[PDB]
Amino acid sequence: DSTDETPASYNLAVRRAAPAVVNVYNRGLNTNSHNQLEIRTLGSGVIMDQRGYIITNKHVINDADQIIVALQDGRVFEALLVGSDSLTDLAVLKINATGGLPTIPINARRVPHIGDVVLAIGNPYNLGQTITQGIISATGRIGLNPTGRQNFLQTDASINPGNSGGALVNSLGELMGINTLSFDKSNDGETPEGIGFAIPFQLATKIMDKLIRDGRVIRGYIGIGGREQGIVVNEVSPDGPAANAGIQVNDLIISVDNKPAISALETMAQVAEIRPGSVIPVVVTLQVTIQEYPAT
């Protein structure tokens, strides 16, 4: 056999997306360091737009004395922490570049489907930009933690330490999500294989926009945590807007703010959207003024 044939390849996706994916270094001083910077943690980051805003995980840049960003083209920048959000484990970095910057392809009209071929781009173990290939295993995953939803994309594209904050793209090179977490829980002590999670791009975008506009993400906070037709109240926070509304533990809640309350997650999402300081109707009819979510 002779070959004028063309090898099956995802190089096109690689060429479109990889340049925008950067190596992120969290450097910190040590009592050991004696005035010398050392790497606390390392991960990846995605260049969202030509202004030089970069998405990455919050745990990658946490407690950093200095943040270094390295492009694949060789350029190195010191990075400015625009803001972070523990809840989505996201963070925005700013680098200033007079010269042109590569950006990650984004198609906001694109709908990620289960079975879509995807590439994970990142910096595993600081070996240099690695490309691994998998599919979208699932969508709307809550992750390993039972609480907090977060609509994770699940992928079997190989993910390792250093991949955090990196990009997940399809064969077209479009951004699917931000690689964040790898499943490690063991039943019988075995090691989970091909189970990793990414923040969906749509969510990543919204969070980035809010961090660029304000130093933090702002959510309306009732003050009360409860477990689920209706939703009962399991705990009212001490000295809470809650307590100030004088809410009573356990009163079932049928609906809120001109809307029904069957799913708690749907309800909390609604609560988050609402501006802090606003007062709304609740069905158990007691008035309460929301305060912005307590910082974490």
């Binding site: 609480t147 009360i224 945590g225 409860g226 399991n234 708690a264 997650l265 309800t267 909390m268 988050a272």
Partner: peptide
């Protein structure tokens, strides 16, 4: 448990 859900807090909000």
């Amino acid at each position: 448990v859900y807090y909000f």
